[PDB]
Amino acid sequence: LVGANGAGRMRIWVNTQKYRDQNDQEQFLMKQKAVMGISSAIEGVRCFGAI
Amino acid sequence: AGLYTTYQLLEVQRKLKTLPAFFLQWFPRQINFQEDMIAFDKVIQDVTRV
């Protein structure tokens, strides 16, 4: 959804993956009635404790 | 003419109706088996679970 000279651009993704619940039910991974906008500057960290 | 007329016959006009293969184009494999039945197996493996 870009403007003219690479300005104000939006990339639209649609996600409807369905994981199986803890209680063994179908549930939508991305929430279906919602809009999420995420950037790569969230800089997330995979934490792993002790086994 | 006289008793009855003469005739020059042209070619026979044969209206011929066919039924060409539109649905068979998705059925490519042919199996000519002599046995009784045909066994299938379908397996669904649910992995997408937390």
Automatic annotation (TrEMBL), chain A:
Q: What does this protein do?
A: Assembles to form an icosahedral capsid. The assembly is primed by the interaction between capsid assembly protease and portal dodecamer, and major capsid proteins assemble cooperatively to form the procapsid with the help of capsid scaffolding protein. Major capsid protein forms hexons and pentons of the icosahedron. Viral genomic DNA is packaged into the procapsid through the portal vertex. The packaging triggers a dramatic reconfiguration of the capsid shell.
Q: What is this protein called?
A: Major capsid protein
According to the record's subunit comment, the protein's assembly and interactions are: Homomultimer.
What protein family does this chain belong to?
A: Belongs to the lambda phage major capsid protein family.
Traced from the root, the source organism's taxonomic lineage reads:
Viruses, Duplodnaviria, Heunggongvirae, Uroviricota, Caudoviricetes
Q: Which gene encodes it?
A: YSD1_17
Source organism: Salmonella phage YSD1
Localization, per the record, is: Virion; Host cytoplasm
Whole-protein coverage range? 254 to 304 of 354
